[PDB]
Amino acid sequence: PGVTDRIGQMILEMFRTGMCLFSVRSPGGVAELYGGEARKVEITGTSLTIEREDWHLHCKLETVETVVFDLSPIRMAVVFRDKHQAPVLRAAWLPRLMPETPSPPEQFWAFTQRYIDLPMVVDARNRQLVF
Give contact residues for a copy of itself (rule: CB under 8 A).
22, 24-35, 52-64, 80, 82, 84, 86-89
Closest CA to 34 of 111, 100, 98: 98
Q: Which is nearer to a copy of itself, 48 or 130 (CB)?
A: 48
Q: Which is nearer to a copy of itself, 89 or 98 (CB)?
A: 89
At closest approach, how far in Å is the CB of 70 from a copy of itself? 17
At closest approach, how far in Å is the CB of 37 from a copy of itself? 10
At closest approach, how far in Å is the CB of 12 from a copy of itself? 14
Give the integer Cα–Cα distance in Å for 124 and 74.
13
Q: Which is nearer to a copy of itself, 71 or 89 (CB)?
A: 89
Q: Which is nearer to a copy of itself, 47 or 103 (CB)?
A: 47
Give the integer Cα–Cα distance in Å for 84 and 99.
36
Give the integer Cα–Cα distance in Å for 47 and 74.
31
Closest CA to 69 of 12, 109, 104, 33: 109
Query: In angstroms, how far is CA 128 from the centroid of its own chain?
Result: 22
At closest approach, how far in Å is the CB of 105 from a copy of itself? 24
